[PDB]
Each structure stands twice: as C-alpha cells, then as structure tokens.
Design a binder for these strands. Structure first.
Lengths: 174, 293, 159, 59, 208
RNA sequence: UUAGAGGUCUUGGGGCAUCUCAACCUAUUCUCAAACUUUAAAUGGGUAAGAAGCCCGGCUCGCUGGCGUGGAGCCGGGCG
RNA sequence: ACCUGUCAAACGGUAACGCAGGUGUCCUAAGGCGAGCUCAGGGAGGACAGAAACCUCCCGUGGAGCAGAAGGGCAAAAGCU
RNA sequence: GUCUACGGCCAUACCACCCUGAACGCGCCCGAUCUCGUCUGAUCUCGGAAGCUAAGCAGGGUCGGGCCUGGUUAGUACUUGGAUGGGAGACCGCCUGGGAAUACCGGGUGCUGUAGGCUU
C-alpha cells in the first residue's frame, strides 16, 4: 500500500550481523584448528574467548581459552547465512526465534558448507545466530546522544518469521 | 506471571534521575569540572574554553566561560557562514574546521581590539605555532580546547579548528600530536601532510581517484561539488582565498529579525475540565454500549 | 572506652541525602569566597579530600585564607570550659555562604538610604528593630451570627 | 580495689565559675597560615607604597 | 526450667530481636497464629472481638500459646470447629536473656551478659492481643472465650467488640453499601479497596 | 515475619486422560528492629544583630591577567 | 597501643571483664595519569551443552566491585580492560 | 510559537504505551581514498548528500505508576518546664509551652541563562 511503500526505506528488515561461534572445552592446538576453520569460512581472523569461572566437571579453568567466535556483516554475512540455511534445507522451528526478533541454528559439519576436508583440521561444527535490525538501530550503540530505539521500531517474534518466509522461502514447523 | 518485576513501584520510588544533560548524552561532567572551574584565588577571573562541536552538517565553534546561572558565549563562529567567504561545499570537513576556528579567532580579536596586534600566522604551514605576548601591548587571549565527547585521536576535526584558532592569534595550549601529519610508528610530525589536510588536498585526491575509477560513483559521492563547479584543481586556491576573506572581514552581521504572526504548531495542554469531562463521557459510553448489547 | 578514630560516629552526618548522590553540582565550585566572609561548614562524604573534622560540622566561621581549592576558616571551638579560635583548611565542597550575614548587610543598606531619604524629606523614621509589641485594641464583629457553642465530646473506646 | 572510671559531673559548674570567655578580638589579626605566595606580594606592595607619594599629595 | 514470668515483665530493655548479632535463640513456643476456618470469606464472619491490652508490658510466647489454645478449645465446643476464625495479633520478637546457672568458670557479676532464654512480645496500652471473627449470634461465646484467655496473661486486659466488619478496617455499618457500590471487592478472608485513581480499564473490568 | 486470594513457565511431587498440592508471580493482609529506613520532632549546638561600620576619591604590587582585569595593601574625605 | 557500627539520650564529649567485630598486615601496583567500557542478577534464543562451558538480543539505580572488619562514598565512577 | 551549541537548578524534568511534528536545525542515512581504529567501517575516525521522519528528539494524551505540593491523620504520637497529682506497681491524668509520620483525599507534571537560527 501507500504506507508500505513510504515505510520501505526506513522500516525495513535487514541483517545487522551474523555471529559464528565454535566452543570446545580444550585449549592449545585443538582450538587453533577451529580458528582456521572460521578463517577459511569468513575470511576474517577470529578471536578467542576465555572461561569466566572454573568448572572441574567440564575440565575448564578460569582465563583459559575455550571458544572462538567471529562477527560477519554486510553481503558477506548474507552469503554465509545462505550456505548455512542450505545445509538446514531452509527449515526452522518456531522456538528458534527469540522474543527480540533474532534467531539461530547449528551446523554440524563445517566441511559441507564451503570447503574441503584437510588431514590436519578437525571435524568441528559451529553455531549460527542472526541479529536482525532496522535502519535506526545504531543510536543505542553510538556514544554521543545515545537512546533507545522506540517501541514500534522494535522487531517482534512474528515479523522475524515473516522475513524468513518472504526472503528465503523458508518453512517454520512447531 | 512468571518472573519478579524489576521496574516495580519501589524501583521508581528510590530512583535518582541523572543530570538532564547526562541523560541526554551531551555533557561529560567529569571533564567539565576539570575544565571550567577557576582557582579560588583567581576571584572572578574568567576561565575561557573553546567549544568545538562537529554535527552531521555543520561545525560550531564557541568561546565561553562558566557562571553560576550559565555559560556566556563571548564569540561564536559556525561553518554555514563559510559560503559568505567562498567555501560553498564541504562544510564539515577538516578544511572547513580550520576556517571556522580561524573565523572564531579573528572575530574575537576584532571585538577585543587585538586584531592588529596579534596577526597569528598568515602564511599557512602545518608546523607548530604559538602566539607569544608582546611587551607593552595587551596580552594574548588564552583558551582551552573543549572536545566534548569526541574521541581524541590523530586527525580529529576538533584539532583542525584548534589549529585555525592558534593560527588566528589565540593562545591555546596543545601538542603537535593529534594533527593529521603525525606518525605513530616514527613519533614524528610532518607539517606537509597537515598542510595538505588544511587545504583539502585529501579531498581533491579522492575526487581524482573516483573520476579515474568510476564516474558513476564520483557523481554519487560529489553531487553538490559538481553543482557548485568545485574542481579538484581549484580547492587549494578556494581555501586560500577564504582564509584571506576571513582575515579581512571577520565581523558578523546578525540576520535581521522579522515580525511574524504567532501560529501555534503544537497542541496546548488540556485543562482540568477537559480531562474530567473526557472520563465522564468515556464512562457513559461504556455503560450505554454494554446496555445496548 | 571508645576509639579516637577521626570518622567515628559520622555514619549519618557525612552521608549524602536520599536521592541526592552522584555528581557534585558545579555551582558549588563556582561560589566565590573572599577574605572576611562567613561560611557554614558541612562535610560532604562524596569528596574525601579537605574534609573538616566532625566537631566543625554545623559550625560557622569566617574566611582568613583563600587557596586554589580550599579555604582557611577561623572557627570557634569549645574545649572543656574555654572557647578558642581554631584555624582549619577545608576544601570548597564542604562549605557554603552563610545567609545570616547577607541579611544584615541588606538591613544596613536600607537603613543608610532611609536616613538619606528622611534627611532630604525632613522627617523621622524608625530604624531600630523592636520586639513584637502587645496586640492593640480592636473590635470583632459578629455579623449577626452567634458564636458556635463547643462542648467536650463523650469518651469512646476504639480498637 | 575498684573505683570510679569517668565522669563529667561538676565540670560545667567549674567552667562557669570564671566564665566561658570568648576569644579576644583585635582589629588586626595574624597573617600566620595565609598563602606564602600571597605574603610575598603584599610585602612588595607595602615596600613600594612610598613611590607615588607625590601623586597622592597632589590629589 | 523456666523462670517465673514476673522476672521478665516490665519492658526494661531496648528491643533485642533475633539477628546476626543475637544467635542461638530458642524457637518460640507459639508457631501458629491463625486458627479455625481461615478460608472463610468476609461476608460470613461479620462480628469481631478483641482482647485489648491495658498495660505496657511484655507477654511471653508461652503465654500467647496457652491463651490461643484455651480460646480455641472453648470456641470449638460452643460454636463448632468451623464457625470461627482466631488470629493472634502479637508476634514474639524480643529476646530475653538469662545469666549463668550457678573452679573452671568465672562466677559473680564479671562478664554477666546473658544468653538467650526465650522470646516475649512487647505490647502497648490499647493494643490488640487476639482477635476472633464469627457470626453475629456468637457474641456471648466470643466474650466468654476471650475472658478465659485473660487468665493466661499477667496484666490487665479488656474485651472489646469492634465496630468494624470482621478483620477488615472498614466499618460494619457501611461495609455492605461499599460492596454493592463496588468500592470493596472481597478477596479471601479480607477485602480490597478500589479507588478512582487508576487506569479506566480496571473500572471497565469491574463494571463489566 | 502471619494468613487467605487470583494467575501460570513448572530440569516438582502425590493420588490416579489427567486432577489436586508444592513452587513461582501479582494484588492484598497480621506483627517487628540498639548495631534498619523514605519521613521526622521537643529540648540542643554554631553564627550575626555596625564606627574594627557604610559610602566616595586616589596611590602601590615582583601576585593574577584579553583588558581601563582581579585580589590584597596603603593614603585622604564624608556620614552618628 | 589502635580502627568500625551501637551504647550515646538528633552539635561535640561520655562509663562497665557493655554488645557485634577487626589490627601488628598487603600492594611496582591494588601508587599516578589518560583513554575506552559497564557491574550483580534475570528473561529469551543458539550443534554436541545438561541446574552451571561459550555466542547473541533485551531488562537492569548499582541490588556487583573497590584485598583485609564495618560504616560512609562512588556508574561515559573510585568499578573492569 | 519552536529549535540548535554550551549550561544552571537536577524527575513538576523520570518510566510505560499511543497521537502529531510546518520551516530551519538535530538526526537516522550513503561510502571507506585519505586521518584513525576494529574479528567485523557495528562502534570510533574520516568523505559525503540519493532517501526518510519509521527511530532518536520536541509537543500533546492516559479516572497511568513515580515525583512535587497541599489537606487528612491531628492538636493525635512525642516532648521543655511543674506539683507533698493519682496508682502496690506498670504506667496514667492535669498545669505551662512546642508539636510530628503512614494509610486515605485532592492539585500540578520543568523553569530558565548566554550565543545563533526558523516561524519571511
């Protein structure tokens, strides 16, 4: 309608960022393999995450590098998400969507996404998370005159699904 | 009902609102205390600062001192009066920042009678310059930069206006660092790179880079430059001519006030009678509707 | 016996008022104190430097020295039957101007100007303050309305 | 063996017998404790008050 | 095992509650304060009676337990086990101490600060001790039950029939009119008070 | 720290498609604090109620300083 | 010999082998300055992952932390890097 | 009638949700050659001007929560001073002065300083 056309510029859904995370309870040369996996998939150097507390049953110590993660934005994030949704064959559940307008899924095999298996690398999977947003969402991140994004400008759990079905022709099952 | 409500009645009862300009995100009161407070044995002596604020479309330069009921602006120069001096486009870039600072400096010295005594540095170079007071003459005006919430990094446009003001004749303490020509790996300052930024050569290089690479992208990034016929070759002369114009006539002519018809563009507050009546008819409508059904 | 600690028993006197914590308002640093003016001492716990001792909280003295951030004050302190004029250095945050002196300086002004007006007008005007005099004689009108008759109420045992 | 520990009894009576005298006030007070940099200037100001005596006398 | 109640009666100390400063306090003898049909609505127990204190003293938890038991036993026999509701309006929060019961120990008044012995409730003049709500026809039984519970308390108490409706704070003469005019919404044993000082949606729900 | 009431995600339980309890939440309710408090007395403590004051004119300074700036000091004069 | 809250009777001072506690240290940083961030907790999501691993959004007046006990103070702080 | 830059007092200014926003501005917004900084031009820094008031921001609204202010509570609670007052005590009354705080019920919902615009 007329309202929809005039709202198309600024009230438009887009992917703010794609968050890729690989968590392995070990350190050392084990997670160095995971870092190269994200390096090949995204073209970006990932960053390691340390354990907040010490848990003996998980075999992790405080301040020990455990996970690797990376954030991808732009058309690169669009293409990496397309590959991950391909593996999941465009199928998500309703519970995969949060009340804040975001969603995520998991891929078990990194090899089948983009690359070929190498003898030195492992068998790690990874986690996808999509942070959806609208144009004026950066005012909560800026330093000078920061503000909240308003109530009607936020994304709900419903319109997140609608964007998934309209763009990727996806299916949501209960 | 699943989880305990955090923003409950008791939460608001003992909530303390921040300062108004803290919760607007405009004033960092940690820096303001250390910047505007005068020593107590300097009774009534004004402490001057130079406010430089870069908005999306304008650069604002002001000189102010603090008083109990509020700041006095002794002088202000905006970047949107640069078309009067020749600069029609790029009113928020480093070159325009230098001009706004220079205009603020010349305008203030003219008011105080020190324009002829303190000429600053007319021949522009990026090198370090500081005004020294002349014996027997009135001393040099001393000011301190107020960068606000701007991240002070090398090449920040607040230091562009600082350079224009110190070149105009104001005594503002600073280091040659944080100017665009400073090098982090060598810890050396190159005045030529700084001078290029003052004349907008880094902008002219971008224009030439875009014309060679993609004409369509060049028009998109520079449309008002083309509409105003600002060629990359004439940018240095345009900024040089603007500097002379500011130095020759820095006085500001106020826009004449026009009497207009007072038309309200906002809703006035409803009175007690209106608010009470509205509840009366809302109650009556609910009773009537429930009776009809 | 109890301790000789400097901040013993200042749990409430150096605490900030309710919903008045946080940044010190900047006009307190902008108040100007000259040599000879009278200031009230009131320690603020937000600033721990230049803090007056608890025995000077609520005391009033006059400025004898002005420094970059602090002020020297001549304050009377009672010590076991003798009053001595102590000299203490207090940062600006813990003091404020005393309004009793400002009121008196105003009264001196209106007195001097009333003398000048009286001399120029050839009249005499009262300048000394006087205690509240006995109420003057006056009439009270009933307006044709009888006074309402009051009477003690019966006793009732409530809950 | 055991005795009294502390009391302020009869102390206020002792104090008021000779009075709680306020400190004496003088028109000129001590410059002890005021800013040394401020003292140095004031002495220089007093030292050179002799100059301008001719202007003071004429005025 | 316990001292006579005359040793602890006159509220001679500051309140000394159970806290991180006072540990090792034995549990109070009274642990149940509401008895009878607690689930009854406002409209079924309109009459209320109080045992009002007439002295400034402290009553032991044992005394509160004894009075509650004997008041309950009478009102069950006379009014049935589901024809009343008793509320003890006093909680023992003050801790009373005892000095040591008397070679290897320091005798005398040396180090004489005591250990917790029990709990008492400080009561003021005109303060309600116990309350009973019942039907209007059981007035004589309420007075009798509270009269017998008087003998368990040291000082002087007065029995008063309230002018309010049950355990609520609203007068019995205006209670029914307020409920009809929707100013008082019953909820549980008590009632809720509805002002005209909220969003109109609540008013819509009440009148729908 | 006492008691009912209205809803429900329930890594809860019990009697048996389940249903009641417990848990949690929400709005109420009884009773409290020397080492708790939004509020907050009475009686307290400090200061001031002029000639060492007030108002004019001038001089000095190496301190402060856009400035005829500011601050302090000093010299005259007037006003009971 | 010292320190915190209370006693202590709303200035200060105030006793008992009164009550509740702490001290004879610890730190080249946990001293100083600058910059950039926001903490406890909770809700909703995400492969292995579960009451507790890590990633993301939201709420969060401080309910965390500031080495020692306690009181005060503190949020583009005095907290973290 | 409003805005911007810098503020003063720091909720009558905050919080939740809805409506409206002319013109300047403030923004959202477009981009990464240079300055600068990142895992990520998201933030920060820089160069802009195709679009948009959806958001921030402003004004209004809500028998709105909070906040401010006033009634009530109440001459109640408490309290200076007094008596060869009462009472076995606990405690209470009176004379002489001062004098509160919830619940409950109303009203209000930023004022303003310096400098510079728009309302032509």
């Amino acid at each position: 309608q007329d309202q929809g056309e005039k709202e198309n510029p600024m009230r438009e859904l887009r992917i703010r960022k794609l968050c890729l995370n690989i968590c392995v309870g070990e350190s050392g040369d084990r997670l160095t393999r995971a870092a190269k996996v994200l390096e090949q998939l995204t073209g970006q150097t990932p960053v390691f995450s340390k354990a907040r507390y010490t848990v003996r049953s998980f075999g992790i110590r405080r301040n020990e590098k455990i996970a690797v993660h990376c954030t991808v934005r732009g058309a690169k994030a669009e293409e990496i998400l397309e590959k991950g949704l391909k593996v999941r064959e465009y199928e998500l559940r309703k519970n995969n969507f949060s009340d804040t307008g975001n969603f995520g899924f998991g891929i078990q095999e990194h090899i089948d996404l983009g690359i070929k298996y190498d003898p030195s690398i492992g068998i790690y999977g990874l986690d996808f998370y999509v942070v959806l947003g609208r144009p004026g969402f950066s005012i909560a991140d800026k330093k000078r005159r920061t503000g909240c994004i308003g109530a009607k400008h936020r994304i709900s759990k419903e319109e997140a699904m609608r964007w998934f079905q309209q763009k990727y022709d996806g299916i949501i099952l209960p | 009902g699943f989880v305990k409500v955090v923003k409950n009645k008791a939460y608001f009862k003992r909530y303390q609102v921040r300062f108004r300009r803290r919760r607007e995100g405009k004033t960092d009161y940690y820096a303001r205390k250390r910047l505007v407070i005068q020593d107590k044995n300097k009774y009534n002596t004004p402490k001057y600062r130079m406010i430089v604020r870069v908005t999306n479309r304008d650069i604002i330069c002001q000189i102010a001192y603090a008083r109990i009921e509020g700041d006095m602006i002794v002088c202000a120069a905006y970047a949107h009066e640069l078309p009067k001096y020749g600069v029609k486009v790029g009113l928020t870039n480093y070159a325009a920042a230098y001009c706004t600072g220079l205009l603020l400096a010349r305008r203030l010295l003219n008011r105080f009678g020190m324009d002829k005594i303190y000429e600053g540095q007319v021949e522009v170079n990026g090198g370090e310059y500081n005004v020294e007071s002349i014996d027997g003459q009135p001393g040099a005006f001393t000011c301190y930069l107020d960068a606000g919430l701007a991240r002070t990094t090398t090449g920040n446009k607040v230091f562009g206006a600082l350079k224009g003001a110190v070149d105009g004749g104001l005594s503002i303490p600073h280091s040659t660092k944080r100017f665009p020509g400073y090098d982090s790996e060598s810890k050396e300052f190159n005045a030529e790179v700084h001078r290029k930024h003052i004349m907008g050569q880094n902008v002219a290089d971008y224009m030439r880079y875009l014309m060679e690479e993609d004409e369509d992208a060049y028009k998109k990034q520079f449309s008002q430059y083309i509409k105003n016929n600002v060629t990359p070759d004439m940018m240095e002369e345009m900024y040089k001519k603007a500097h002379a114009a500011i130095r020759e006539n820095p006085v500001y002519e106020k826009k004449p006030k026009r009497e207009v018809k007072k038309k309200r563009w906002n809703r006035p507050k409803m009175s007690l009678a209106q608010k009470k009546d509205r509840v009366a008819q809302k109650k009556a409508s609910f009773l009537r509707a429930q009776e009809r059904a | 016996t109890n301790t000789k600690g400097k901040r013993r028993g200042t749990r409430y006197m150096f605490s900030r008022p309710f919903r008045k914590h946080g940044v010190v308002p900047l006009a307190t640093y902008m108040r100007i104190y000259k040599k000879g003016d009278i200031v009230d001492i009131k320690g603020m716990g937000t600033v721990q430097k230049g803090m007056p001792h608890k025995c000077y909280h609520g005391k009033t003295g006059r400025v004898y020295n002005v420094t970059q951030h602090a002020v020297g004050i001549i304050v009377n302190k009672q010590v076991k039957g003798k009053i001595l004029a102590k000299r203490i250095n207090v940062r600006i945050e813990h003091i404020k101007h005393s309004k009793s002196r400002d009121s008196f300086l105003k009264r001196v002004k209106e007195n001097d100007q009333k003398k000048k007006e009286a001399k120029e007008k050839g009249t005499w005007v009262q300048l000394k303050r006087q205690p509240a005099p006995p109420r003057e004689a006056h009439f009270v009108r009933t307006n044709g309305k009888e006074p309402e008759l009051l009477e003690p109420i019966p006793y009732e045992f409530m809950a | 063996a055991k005795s009294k520990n502390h009391t302020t009894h009869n102390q206020s009576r002792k104090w008021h017998r000779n009075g709680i005298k306020k400190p004496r006030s003088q028109r000129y007070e001590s410059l002890k404790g005021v800013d040394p940099k401020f003292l140095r200037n004031m002495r220089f100001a007093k030292k050179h008050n002799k100059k301008g005596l001719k202007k003071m006398q004429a005025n | 095992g316990r001292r006579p109640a005359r040793c602890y009666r006159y509220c001679k100390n500051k309140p000394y509650p159970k806290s991180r400063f006072c540990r090792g306090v034995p549990d109070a003898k009274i642990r149940i304060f509401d008895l009878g049909r607690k689930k009854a609505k406002v409209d079924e127990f309109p009459l209320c009676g109080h045992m009002v204190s007439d002295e400034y003293e402290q009553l032991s938890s044992e005394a509160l337990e004894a009075a509650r038991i004997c008041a309950n036993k009478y009102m069950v026999k006379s009014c049935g086990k589901d024809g009343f509701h008793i509320r003890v309006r006093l909680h023992p929060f003050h801790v009373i101490r005892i000095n040591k019961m008397l070679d290897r120990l320091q005798t005398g008044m040396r180090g004489a600060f005591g250990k917790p012995q029990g709990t008492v409730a400080r009561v003021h003049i005109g303060q309600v001790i116990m309350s009973i709500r019942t039907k209007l026809q059981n007035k004589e039984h309420v007075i009798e039950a509270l009269r017998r519970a008087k003998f368990k308390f040291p000082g002087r108490q007065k029995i008063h029939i309230s002018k309010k409706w049950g355990f609520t704070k609203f007068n019995a003469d205006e209670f029914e009119d307020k409920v009809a005019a929707k100013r008082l919404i019953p909820d549980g044993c008590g009632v809720k008070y509805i002002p005209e000082r909220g969003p109109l949606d609540k008013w819509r729900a009440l009148h729908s």
